[PDB]
Amino acid sequence: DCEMKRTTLDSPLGKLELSGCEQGLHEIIFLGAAVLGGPEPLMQATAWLNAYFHQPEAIEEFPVPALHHPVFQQESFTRQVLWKLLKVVKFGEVISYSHLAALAGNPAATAAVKTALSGNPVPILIPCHRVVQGDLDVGGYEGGLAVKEWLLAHEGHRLGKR
Numbered sequence: 617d618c619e620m621k622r623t624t625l626d627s628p629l630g631k632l633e634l635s636g637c638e639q640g641l642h643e644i645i646f647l648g649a650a651v652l653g654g655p656e657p658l659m660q661a662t663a664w665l666n667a668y669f670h671q672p673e674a675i676e677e678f679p680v681p682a683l684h685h686p687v688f689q690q691e692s693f694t695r696q697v698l699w700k701l702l703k704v705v706k707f708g709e710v711i712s713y714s715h716l717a718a719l720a721g722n723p724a725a726t727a728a729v730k731t732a733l734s735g736n737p738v739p740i741l742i743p744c745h746r747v748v749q750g751d752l753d754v755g756g757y758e759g760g761l762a763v764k765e766w767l768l769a770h771e772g773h774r775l776g777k778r
């Protein structure tokens with residue numbers, strides 16, 4: 617019911633479509649009036665993703681856009697999983713599904729964590745690629761394994777592959 621605008625960007629992973637309202641970013645989708653630099657969520661999201669890919673050493677300098685997908689508008693374990701992942705798991709780190717489950721308030725709910733991650737509407741920004749099965753097992757990805765491994769390699773992680 618929000619008044620939605622969209623923008624596209626090029627990335628090493630193909631074209632990304634951003635959609636959002638004045639209250640926040642809604643979605644980042646892999647497709648395979650505002651000026652850049654502005655405070656509008658879509659513009660902040662654009663800036664953040666471009667820095668992620670092209671100036672990753674500066675990534676913490678960039679404002680994280682407000683998020684307004686309906687999954688962020690109400691309390692839930694799914695929201696806890698997404699927000700805790702965003703808040704806690706930094707560029708270049710990973711966390712296991714099981715430790716994220718505990719972080720999000722339900723230790724041992726690994727399958728529910730996986731379901732929440734599959735429903736992440738803002739991939740890369742909320743870093744579902746940094747959630748792994750265990751120390752030697754990168755686990756699965758809603759976007760596909762090759763993408764998960766590529767992102768981890770971009771961030772210099774041991775579990776990265778490209």
Ligand SMILES: [Zn+2]
Pocket residue numbers: 618619636637638639640642684685
């Ligand atoms: Zn909205």
